[PDB]
Ligand binder design. Structure first.
Ligand code: LOP
Ligand code: LOP
Ligand code: HEM
Ligand code: HEM
Ligand code: BOG
Ligand code: BOG
Ligand code: BOG
Ligand code: HQO
Ligand code: CA
Ligand code: ZN
Length: 754
């Protein structure tokens, strides 16, 4: 019964939090805005069907528009937010209809006020899944319908391709998820629907299905009381637990303890370290991630360029033709997760034999096979996205094309081969680790924790399958975040962490006992806040008001584990010094330390800059989000992968040929460039965009007009300095990875014994 209480706590934490999430998941499904079987006029004339709405949404995914603009604040920022934009048109129309832009202020005042009292009342009948909307609203639906036909035909005057939507892209009829009916009327319908629930009061409630989001006076959308109250409450509860956790942390010494006495640093003779065929094979895995990292960055350079030159890349042509923003965005996200995730799977391959004590038979075979599996998935899924968005696919867009969800752009059959790949991966890890699990008595020991977390990798991605074209937007978004917020960060904040504890225990730098207890404490506070904290993504995506409290409170608690960082980085810096200038893992620790500092600054402070429900009300779906997004994603996960990537490359390259000079340069260039693009561009544009929404309405902050202001453009233009500096850091890494295969060692032991 070694760490019994810590186990009860962790298990209980996981149990309780998982329930809350599921309960809240249920309340969403049950309280999200409805999609009526028929929405119609005062004459009883049907204009919309649950099937239309599902289709509009479907073509929106079909054409990967979520990698261009947003809906309900989620998606890309090059384009606008269709919910807020469609809501304005629909509202403007209602004004004109009742206006029968020339009226007096005393006059436009009256009408405005009239459309307010009329549009915010819920006219949906729960008893009968049908919604009826006044004429003033139908006239509005018209303007919305016309508006987007012009848009998806003529373009949006900013980055969007002309007449991108065309029937010829899909069969006469019997179209996959989109309905038998003009496609660009389904879209206008989908957009209108989101715009409908965003401005219509929930039944019995006093605020809308999105808690009065987006901000927009003309529609009566203003900040809710919950948004302000929970901003204060969430922080006070955080202040309360920081104290409590700090005390628990201090009283139980819940951190790693050095395993060596003063001056007694352990010897690290990498030259006489068993090496196996599967490890050296996992070595080339890293040069590819290093390469995917290179291309991923480039697409980023491209996206940033498009804010300054919308439809061209320095005059050239094919570029905006074959590689437009939405498509480039998708790859940027897809490759980010791909190279970072993949870096840790490789790390898993690499340490697997070490945990077991030998090379599993056919390991190299399986490893090599897993290799060409992802390489296919990557090259393949990307090809699919191109064909899918472009229309050179039929009803195979969902299965092989672009699924239409930011962060989840690959097609389902592509997702299937993904899980199998991970499943295989899992098998490979298990084969090599298996015997370790057998020698390890304590079922909650290091190796068991390493194995339990490793399995969450493939398993947890399965929740993505609860998502498909006809799912209600809010409910599908609910599950999407399980992958973005729980999965991606489950791959890195749990698996990676236990993998490092293992590495530090192996190098004999920290006591094993000390380490597993530490992991327990981290996992409980990490899952104790993060699981429910997922909710801050549900403030305004249409989920019930309950998530504003739940999300605000638990995401704020996520900061707690983060402050026990700047000081963990120091303990690491410290032992890095305890090892002289001949310390083999210098580069690894420099990236390790950085991961930690960016965790406090990128996720901690920049993430919190936009966490308050009162702030998010205006900020949600704006430049500060990417500001935080980079500081956190690249600052934390990227650096971490790189730390581990270099750790392996060190156990594979012949020492004599190694030189961490170039790595110091990369580390400096990566860190400075990241901070530079966040501070010099993303941050200041974010403030302007939030200010712009506060004074004119969120629609104004999301119009291309905002991106066109000179001030915005200059801010946007100077991003090239730090983006280049970042780019330089990544090529140095690439160049070090590539010309590293030229100095590799060869396996010491085969299916032998270490
Ligand atoms: C919006 C603001 C966001 C700010 C984000 C800040 C991120 C902070 C990043 C820190 C990187 C830490 C890297 C390891 C530091 C500890 C080990 C170390 O530095 O050893 C150094 C060389 O380090 C190295 O060679 C490692 C490379 C150090 C390069 C740091 C550049 C970071 C600049 C951040 C501010 C723009 C040896 O030289 P010394 O000056 O004696 O070391 C002591 C200074 N730490
Ligand atoms: C909504 C979802 C939210 C996220 C939830 C998943 C999070 C995944 C990430 C990390 C999970 C780490 C879980 C560690 C739990 C350890 C509990 C534990 O080991 O208790 C042990 C028995 O465990 C046992 O006998 C085995 C039970 C514990 C492991 C079971 C498999 C768990 C797999 C989870 C991933 C799919 C108590 O007895 P022991 O000390 O092991 O045995 C005697 C030792 N002298
Ligand atoms: C030369 C460096 C880079 C540049 C110029 C760059 C540029 C961009 C641009 C322009 C966007 C557009 C978001 C939008 O409008 O929808 C973006 C998004 C994003 N980038 Fe990068 N990027 C770079 C490096 C990275 C790296 C190294 C990572 C981490 C692996 C990363 C992760 C992301 C993520 C997660 C998003 C989506 C965030 C959001 O939509 O709010 N980027 N990037
Ligand atoms: C290393 C950990 C973290 C990573 C990698 C991360 C990453 C990201 C990314 C990539 C996005 C953009 C999602 C999108 O494209 O729509 C995002 C959004 C967000 N993050 Fe984090 N995050 C982390 C930690 C945190 C923490 C600790 C907080 C709490 C203060 C937080 C609060 C938010 C909020 C509120 C948004 C929503 C922005 C909006 O709706 O406009 N994050 N995060
Ligand atoms: C979320 C915070 C969980 C904290 C769990 C603390 C569990 C402490 O557990 C205690 O640790 C002591 C050593 O420090 C041991 O001597 C005790 O026998 C043991 O019960
Ligand atoms: C600090 C966190 C406080 C959380 C309080 C959650 C209160 C949930 O309250 C419940 O919300 C449901 C809708 O989601 C309603 O259908 C239920 O009738 C209501 O009791
Ligand atoms: C993105 C650009 C990556 C460039 C990688 C260049 C790697 C050069 O690599 C070097 O090539 C020499 C032959 O030319 C060999 O003799 C060296 O052993 C090899 O390390
Ligand atoms: C293959 C596409 C390579 C991209 C080349 C463009 C270089 C480049 C890189 C950037 O990071 C920029 C940031 C802001 C504005 C412009 C930028 N430009 O032009
Ligand atoms: Ca986004
Ligand atoms: Zn989150």
């Amino acid at each position: 019964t070694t760490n019994s209480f810590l186990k009860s706590i962790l298990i209980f934490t996981i149990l309780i939090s998982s329930t809350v999430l599921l309960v809240g998941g249920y309340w969403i499904f049950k309280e999200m805005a409805p999609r009526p079987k028929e929405v119609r006029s005062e004459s009883g004339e049907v204009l919309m069907t649950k099937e239309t709405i599902i289709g509009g949404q479907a073509v929106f995914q079909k054409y990967g528009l979520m990698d261009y603009g947003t809906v309900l604040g989620h998606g890309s920022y090059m384009g606008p937010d269709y919910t807020a934009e469609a809501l304005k048109v629909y509202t403007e129309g209602m004004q004109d209809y009742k206006a029968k832009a020339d009226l007096t202020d005393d006059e436009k005042s009256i009408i405005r006020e009239q459309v307010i009292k009329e549009m915010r009342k819920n006219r949906y009948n729960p008893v009968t899944d049908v919604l009826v909307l006044t004429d003033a609203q139908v006239y509005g639906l018209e303007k919305v319908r016309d508006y987007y036909r012009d848009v998806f035909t003529n373009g949006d005057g900013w980055g969007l391709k002309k007449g991108l939507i065309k029937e010829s892209d899909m069969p006469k009829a019997n179209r996959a998820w989109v309905a038998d009916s003009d496609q660009i009327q389904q879209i206008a319908d989908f957009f209108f629907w989101t715009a409908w629930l965003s401005s219509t009061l929930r039944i019995g409630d006093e605020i809308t299905y999105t808690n009065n989001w987006p901000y927009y006076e003309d529609a009566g959308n203003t900040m809710s009381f919950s948004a302000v109250w929970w901003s204060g409450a969430s922080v006070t509860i955080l202040i309360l637990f920081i104290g409590i956790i700090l005390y628990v942390f201090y009283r139980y010494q819940l951190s790693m303890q050095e395993a060596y006495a003063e001056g007694k640093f352990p010897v690290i003779d990498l030259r006489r370290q068993p090496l196996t065929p599967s490890q050296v094979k996992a070595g080339k895995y890293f040069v590819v991630v290093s390469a995917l990292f290179f291309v991923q960055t480039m697409f980023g350079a491209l996206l940033a360029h498009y804010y300054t030159e919308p439809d061209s890349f320095f005059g050239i042509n094919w570029i905006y033709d074959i590689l437009p923003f939405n498509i480039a965005k998708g790859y940027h996200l897809q490759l980010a997760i791909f190279w970072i995730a993949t870096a840790w799977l490789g790390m898993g391959i690499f340490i697997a034999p070490l945990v077991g004590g030998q090379e599993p038979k056919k390991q190299g075979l399986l490893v090599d096979l897993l290799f060409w599996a992802l390489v296919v998935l990557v090259g393949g899924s990307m090809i699919g996205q191109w064909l899918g968005v472009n229309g050179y696919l039929g009803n195979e867009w969902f299965l092989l094309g672009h699924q239409g969800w930011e962060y989840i752009e690959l097609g389902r059959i592509w997702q299937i081969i993904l899980v199998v790949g991970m499943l295989l991966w899992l098998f490979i890890v298990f084969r090599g680790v298996k015997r370790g699990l057998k020698r390890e008595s304590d079922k909650g020991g290091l190796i068991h924790l390493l194995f339990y977390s490793a399995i969450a990798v493939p398993f947890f991605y399965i929740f993505a399958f609860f998502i498909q074209p006809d799912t209600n937007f809010t409910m599908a978004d609910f599950w999407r975040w399980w992958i973005i917020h729980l999965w991606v960060e489950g791959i890195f904040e749990v698996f990676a962490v236990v993998v490092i504890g293992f590495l530090l225990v192996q190098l004999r730098l920290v006591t094993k006992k000390s380490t597993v207890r530490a992991l327990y404490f981290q996992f409980t506070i990490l899952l104790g806040s993060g699981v429910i904290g997922i909710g801050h993504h549900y403030y305004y995506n249409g989920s019930p008001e309950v998530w504003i409290a739940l999300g605000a409170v638990f995401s704020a608690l996520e900061v707690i584990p983060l402050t026990l960082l700047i000081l963990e980085a120091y303990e690491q810096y410290k032992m890095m010094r305890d090892g002289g200038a001949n310390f083999p893992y210098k580069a690894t620790f420099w990236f390790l330390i950085s991961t930690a500092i960016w965790n406090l600054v990128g996720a901690g402070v920049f993430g919190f800059l936009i966490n308050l429900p009162a702030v998010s009300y205006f900020e949600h779906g704006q430049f500060l989000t990417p500001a935080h997004g980079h500081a956190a994603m690249m600052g934390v996960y990227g650096m971490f992968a790189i730390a581990v990537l270099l750790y392996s490359l060190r156990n594979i390259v012949k020492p004599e040929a190694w030189n961490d000079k170039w790595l110091k340069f990369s580390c400096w260039m990566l860190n400075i460039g990241l901070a530079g693009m966040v501070v010099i561009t993303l941050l200041p544009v974010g403030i302007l965009q939030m200010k712009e929404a506060f004074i004119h309405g969120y629609w104004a902050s999301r119009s291309p007009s905002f991106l066109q202001q000179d001030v915005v453009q200059n801010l946007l233009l100077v991003r090239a300095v730090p983006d280049t500096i970042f780019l330089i850091g990544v090529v140095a890494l690439l160049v070090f990875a590539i010309k590293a295969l030229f100095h590799l060692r060869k396996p010491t032991h085969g299916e032998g014994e270490e």
